[PDB]
Amino acid sequence: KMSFGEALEVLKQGMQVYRSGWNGKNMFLFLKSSDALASNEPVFGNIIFIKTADNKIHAWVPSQTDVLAEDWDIVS
Amino acid sequence: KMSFGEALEVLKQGMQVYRSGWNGKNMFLFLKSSDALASNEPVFGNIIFIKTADNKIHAWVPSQTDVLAEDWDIVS
Amino acid sequence: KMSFGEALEVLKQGMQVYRSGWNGKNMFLFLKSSDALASDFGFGFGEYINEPVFGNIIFIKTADNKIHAWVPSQTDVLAEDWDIVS
Amino acid sequence: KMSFGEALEVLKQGMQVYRSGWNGKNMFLFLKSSDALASDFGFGFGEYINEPVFGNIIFIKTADNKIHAWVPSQTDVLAEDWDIVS
């Protein structure tokens, strides 16, 4: 379906994405902007989060398989 | 000096760590707890951040070299 | 000059990409597909494997001239300063 | 049962570790040190390399019985449910 580059633009626009090939069920990613994160100092940058399979919110770490996969989809 | 497992316990205690082998200068990590992040719903988990070389705050992604390295140190 | 998604297309075509915003110098990524690994280590039998054991691996030629498995950071994934090694 | 730092000690000793909290089944990590890679691909000359080109690589035996380069997630790094493959 969707590539990771396409899934990123969906994330940069505020929607939630996921991979059908993931082992965990009901997981998704969402991107929070630097302005929303604050709510010559260093400023925040965009951060991708992950809602895990056990209903927990962590900072997301992409696997090599995630980045190369073609099975991304939008959370409906 | 310090291993990554030792550097993690320093992070879990609120201090800042870094690797001397990193290419970027003046970078460090810090861990924010789930309680501090909020400020059958999914709850936050601990998140490791990184102050980058260009004074930006991102979610940290460990390289394989980071995890196996022995050159960790505490920010003084 | 290009995003990470565009750099992935360049990576999947056997080319090398890099970020000008990286701290280290003379670094680049390259992709070893499952078929490339099966062929390079297959001794002429790789075309008959159908299901190789090694998945796709992205490598990074680091600043120390070593070769590591590349871990995509959120800064790299969200960056817009990717380019092709010329 | 053990933390990630303890699992790293087990990894650096040639043993395999895993997380009971992982979603996939029958998965484990294993480490290929720089010396192991230089020896296994060196054809009896690996002891004379001094500075090998390949760094240490952590691999993951994934649920599909494939072998990938393992990317340490923040959940894995902070987890406390690591154990040794028996």
Ligand SMILES: Nc1ncnc2c1ncn2[C@@H]1O[C@@H]2COP(=O)(O)OP(=O)(O)OC[C@H]3O[C@@H](O[C@@H]1[C@@H]2O)[C@H](O)[C@@H]3O
């Ligand atoms: N010896 C090595 N082995 C494996 N990978 C390496 C590496 N050296 C650099 N990388 C990676 O290659 C890209 C550019 O690296 P650099 O930006 O030039 O250096 P630095 O940012 O200071 O590394 C610190 C942070 O960068 C991130 O990984 C970087 C980054 O994705 C990661 O989060 C790390 O904690």
Ligand SMILES: Nc1ncnc2c1ncn2[C@@H]1O[C@@H]2COP(=O)(O)OP(=O)(O)OC[C@H]3O[C@@H](O[C@@H]1[C@@H]2O)[C@H](O)[C@@H]3O
């Ligand atoms: N085919 C594969 N190739 C490479 N690595 C793979 C993999 N399958 C799983 N992994 C990794 O191995 C550990 C346990 O994996 P699982 O927990 O059993 O599955 P899942 O969490 O749903 O993967 C989704 C998220 O897990 C994270 O990576 C996982 C996780 O570190 C990563 O952030 C990913 O976005």
